[PDB]
Amino acid sequence: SFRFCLECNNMLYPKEDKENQRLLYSCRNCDYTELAEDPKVYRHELITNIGETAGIVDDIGQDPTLPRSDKECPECHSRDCVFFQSQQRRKDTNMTLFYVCLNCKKTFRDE
């Protein structure tokens, strides 16, 4: 996550002080400068799993084309649920199922 300038809404690029030895987020369109909280400047994931379970909506139980199972809900122990596979559509994607209860509407696995 990256922060924005509080006065002109531009991006806050990180900057390093030679004399003070501190990491600071500074806007290049002004003189505003705010002290950085964490040193994690950049992170790149070669193999990522985000978007696998992130594709979830709160009204997925109203879809009539989705199959319905009788798996046990971990939270409220309901007897009706709706399952589907991974929303990510790469070639390496697993065939595991995500179950959605019809009362608490949370996503849970079978393992």
């Binding site: 990180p14 030895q21 501190r22 990491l23 950085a36 040193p39 994690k40 992170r43 790149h44 193999i47």
Partner: protein, 52 residues
Amino acid sequence: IALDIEKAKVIQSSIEYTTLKNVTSATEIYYDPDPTSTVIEEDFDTVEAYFS
């Protein structure tokens, strides 16, 4: 090597191309102005063990 499976697997491993990107999983950039110490707590023990 043709009638032994282990030597064949050794040859196969020695022939196949393997880059850093294959074994790498994630790369990160951190700010740390102390050459002899570090800010990260998980790796602090190992790096101080190295320096000592």
